[PDB]
Amino acid sequence: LHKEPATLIKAIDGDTVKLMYKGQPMTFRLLLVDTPEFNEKYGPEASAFTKKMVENAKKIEVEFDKGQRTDKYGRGLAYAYADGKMVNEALVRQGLAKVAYVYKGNNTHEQLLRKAEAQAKKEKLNIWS
Ligand SMILES: Cc1cn([C@H]2C[C@H](OP(=O)(O)O)[C@@H](COP(=O)(O)O)O2)c(=O)[nH]c1=O
Ligand SMILES: [Ca+2]
């Protein structure tokens, strides 16, 4: 997989963010995770966590996997990086997302993320508390 440039347009929630990619505004949905909806428990905390990570970044990058790059809603499907740190992984590691939506052929980072989830769960963080 390859990292590509993007810039922040706007934070949205824990697992979606509006970025400019190849010069076009797109909503991105983070691969292999599920944050609570803002309406739900830990929803606001997940939103805040992603918002801080993407707003504080000097450099946003997106990384597409081997399969589908857009979902049925036109959202980009990617791993997102803030100054080299994966947002997807960071959410899971903090117990603010579950590993989820693991589709064949877009699951390169699955085992990385499941390891972070095990650690979050061992620490009883957030969703696992
Ligand atoms: C993360 C992800 C979501 N989706 C679709 C599946 C779900 O369809 P449904 O809307 O019919 O439930 C939805 C969940 O995204 P959200 O968790 O953002 O709601 O997005 C993909 O198709 N591929 C993906 O990789
Ligand atoms: Ca969600």
Side-chain angles (χ1 to χ4, degrees), residues 13-16 29 33-38 40 75 101:
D13 79 345
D15 60 21
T16 57
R29 176 59 165 87
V33 307
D34 196 24
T35 52
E37 301 295 326
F38 181 75
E40 286 159 4
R75 309 183 293 180
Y101 298 103

Side-chain angles (χ1 to χ4, degrees), residues 15-16 29-34 37 71-73 75 77 101 103 106:
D15 60 21
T16 57
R29 176 59 165 87
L30 295 186
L31 282 169
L32 309 185
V33 307
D34 196 24
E37 301 295 326
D71 67 15
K72 67 195 189 178
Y73 302 116
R75 309 183 293 180
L77 295 172
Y101 298 103
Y103 299 94
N106 258 0

